[PDB]
Design a protein around this nucleic acid. Sequence first.
DNA 1: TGAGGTAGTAGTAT
Length: 721
Amino acid sequence: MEAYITEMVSRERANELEVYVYVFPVYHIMRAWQRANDLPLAYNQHTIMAFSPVRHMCGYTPMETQKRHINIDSPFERALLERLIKNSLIFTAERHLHAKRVGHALRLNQVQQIRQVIIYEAIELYVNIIENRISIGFHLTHQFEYVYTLQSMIEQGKTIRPGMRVVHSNGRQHYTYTVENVATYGVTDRCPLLQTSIYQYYVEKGAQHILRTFTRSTRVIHVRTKEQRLSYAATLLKPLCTFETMQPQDVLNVSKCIKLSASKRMKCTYRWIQQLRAQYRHLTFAPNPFTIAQNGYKLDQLSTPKVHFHRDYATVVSGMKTGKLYKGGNIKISVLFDEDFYLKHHITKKDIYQFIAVLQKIAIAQGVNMTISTSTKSITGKFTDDFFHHFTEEVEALQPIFAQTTVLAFITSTHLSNKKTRSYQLLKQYFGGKWDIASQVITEKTIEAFQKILHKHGLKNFYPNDEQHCLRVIDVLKNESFYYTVMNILLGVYVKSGIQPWILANTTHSDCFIGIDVSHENGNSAAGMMNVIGSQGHLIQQAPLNGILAGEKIDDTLLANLLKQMIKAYHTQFQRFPKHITIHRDGFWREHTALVEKIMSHYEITYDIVEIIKKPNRRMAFFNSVDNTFSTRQGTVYQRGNEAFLCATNPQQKVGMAQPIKIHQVTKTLPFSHIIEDVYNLSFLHIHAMNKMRLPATIHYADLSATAYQRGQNQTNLPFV
DNA sequence: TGAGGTAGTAGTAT
Ligand SMILES: [Mn+2]
């Protein structure tokens, strides 16, 4: 009943390894040496490192050669030794375990074949030197390949098209290409760039077992990558297998296969790692090197925080069941009903308004009183099927109608999804973007589910302005699974109209939180800076944060202005300066710390900077020796120095296994345990959803805001539910 | 788009 991680710590030391170093005044030298000598090597700017002497120099003379130990005071040599260890492990895996290097991973034995789709297990490896100790980390994954070549595809009657991505796969070979155009040259005719025919090229390079499969019926396919413009036969190329291109039935089955439980995933990972280390011999490990005791980690268990609605509650769900919201008020809603509901799915405006009435009756028990606007009688029927085909042309005149209100847009899913209409994108970029008008979209699927559940019980006649019937519907929905759908819709409306459903019951150790998230994509790098002003969970402001481009560091001046603005916002809304500010960064802190120090020393505020890593590429679990099963516990921390792994979620077997979060503190103002607890506790502020998110609010809402900003979509401040 | 979880969809040959 002990904790495990997917890491190993070597029993040697970084400076106790005897390595050979060559210095040149150099990729091609290393390639020639690997070709001639069959050894693992590594390179850097002008240095080559090896575990054994290189016999054949291939006509190259280094100035000096040493057999020695590395200097652990130089990042250069530590990185070089890490590369050498990684390459030696890859070399061992390729020779003694039958692995292949595909992309950045090692393909392993095939595990399942589903309708001309092959699933291969894979694994990827990481090497780091942590204070004169060598640590090896490893992650399991999956890969997919077809069975049929392009020659079989052209035989079956299909047509090859430009822009399709294809793969050349053999033993110890793997290459990725894009189809340019099918050529009519044929194998017999000489290829223009090849200076001869494909058959002649292969027979010069060795006929082997490839020319035997060649025949005059095969075709020649051009290939376009970068500028090389390769070209060869259709017998060797295969279409790429990826979840995007796979057929929906294959997508369903393959997704059902690559979603393994904790036990299967961890047992497979450890089985292959033990097989690999039975052949590796440059480093040694314990008989069981996978426990956290062997890795130097400390184990801590966190507890669930309490939340505040009007009294303290153990969980969010119970508080939402039988509580009143932290900050209620009045909400002015509207309706955007398209006649396509009635035309295609036989849903009338009367049923929509009965649904909205049930929403109002649910909301009134939570201290929220929302009323329908009176400007929904002039237009009557305006959102016809032709309206959505001219949304940009017909949207301008509707602004006075929907001014200062929250729009409940009832739009059919086809209009939202179809590329000709693009209802969701245009609706968001107009309402929330140009007019700052919140809106919650509901598709016909939700209303059809509601009607089906009504039909299951006694529908009767839902009279308008009837209390007994709406109370009965509320009671029947109380035990339904559609209840969470209703509650998520209501929470979205609340947050988009300035309602705060709950806060943290207890105050955090820090006084204020600032979250930075840069999500660089294409040629426009938008970002979102937050300020969770409360140590209780409140939000005060947000930032545009879009000048930065190409995902580099934030400019010093803009960062200075943004922290100044955030501090001023705290001072104005609290009438005092905060004692301590904790900064959460999404990714790696690449900003300049001197400006932060100067700015927050001018105001006499202590600060801490914390990095949160969304994808640590590691997995943690508890092994139960009695039953031989791996499990996971929410709120588990592995601690080593100023780095930690946190389990902040509890999924079930049908979806997979929990993803840990990695936390890294780069300052020393506060204890690390307090920082870990704050990160965990800010993840219970999912005021938009009934079920729990994994990241803390400072960066979850930051990534949502940045995503909204890139797409072009104290008053309302979180209109992105 | 009712919402989250996870896991890949991610993050020198011719
Ligand atoms: Mn939403």
